[PDB]
């Protein structure tokens, strides 16, 4: 399973952001809003292949969660689809980035602004977000935003759609890596 593939919790489907690890323990990052309230994650809609259980979740304010893998044999590749990711970097205005998600697949664009606040309502406001002109649609939540072999963010939310164009905001991945003490591979 790699970055961008679908993930299912009890309530719905999101996308795997990046495979990360600390020591010998593997985990995957995804969106906090997908981790909130889910305990087990599976790799298919029928829930027959278990991936693992939620180990941490930060949403609203930030928008990242991590899941620790309990399935010992599924392949946990350090890639996004099949692109390799070898390090993490901070986003910058004008950077060319690409996102992959389980509903729309891969789409590209550029970072247009940093540190934006997005208010999703009912007290769910998130801060510190990367804004871009890449589109994304329901189910794309938590997939990776990367540039080249560099991990940059996790999809959190946006508006528009891919037929007509949209704006998507992403949680900077460096912050999640450092909150959990893990790293990309």
């Amino acid at each position: 399973i790699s970055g961008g593939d679908a993930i299912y919790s009890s309530t719905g489907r999101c996308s795997l952001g990046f495979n990360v690890r600390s020591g010998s323990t593997y985990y995957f990052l995804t969106a906090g809003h997908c981790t909130d309230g889910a305990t087990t994650w599976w790799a298919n809609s029928a829930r027959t292949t278990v991936l693992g259980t939620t180990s941490g979740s930060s949403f609203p304010n930030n928008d990242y969660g991590i899941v620790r893998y309990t399935n010992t044999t599924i392949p946990k590749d350090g890639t996004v689809g099949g692109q390799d990711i070898t390090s993490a970097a901070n986003a910058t205005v004008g950077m060319a980035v690409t996102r992959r998600g389980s509903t729309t697949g891969t789409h590209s664009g550029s970072v247009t602004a940093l540190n934006a606040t997005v208010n999703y309502g009912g007290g769910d406001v998130v801060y510190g977000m990367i804004r871009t002109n890449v589109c994304a649609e329901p189910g794309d939540s938590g997939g990776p935003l990367y540039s080249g072999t560099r991990a940059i963010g996790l999809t959190s939310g946006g508006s528009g759609n891919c037929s007509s164009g949209g704006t998507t905001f992403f949680q900077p991945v460096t912050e999640a890596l450092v909150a959990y003490g893990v790293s990309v591979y």
Binding site: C14, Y120, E137, S141, S156, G157, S159
Partner: protein, 51 residues
């Protein structure tokens, strides 16, 4: 589902679909309620789940 606090300039992107009266599957409640507003109240919910 109540769309009274909409619209919303942005939606989270988890997929938990709903079926609208225009036969389109809406990928989550935030996207469905933003389209009810954009239609000035004429779209309604048909049933939960994909159409």
């Amino acid at each position: 589902v109540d769309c009274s606090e909409y619209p919303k300039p942005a939606c989270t992107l988890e997929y938990r679909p709903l079926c609208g009266s225009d036969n389109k599957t809406y990928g989550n409640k935030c996207n469905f309620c933003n389209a009810v507003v954009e239609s000035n109240g004429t779209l309604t919910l048909s049933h939960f789940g994909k159409c």
